[PDB]
Amino acid sequence: CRWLRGDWRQC
């Protein structure tokens, strides 16, 4: 999704 690489997987 639209966040940092340390976020969750895709949407």
- With beta carbons less than 8 A apart as the criterion, state whether 10 and 1 touch: yes
User: How far apart are the C-alpha atoms of 10 and 5, rounded to whole Å?
Assistant: 10
Q: Which single residue is written with the structure tokens 């949407």?
A: 11
* 5 CB burial (10 A radius; 0-12, 13-18, 19+): exposed
User: How far apart are the C-alpha atoms of 11 and 4, rounded to whole Å?
Assistant: 13
Q: What experiment produced this structure?
A: NMR
Q: Which single residue is written with the structure tokens 């999704």?
A: 1
Q: Which single residue is written with the structure tokens 């340390």?
A: 6
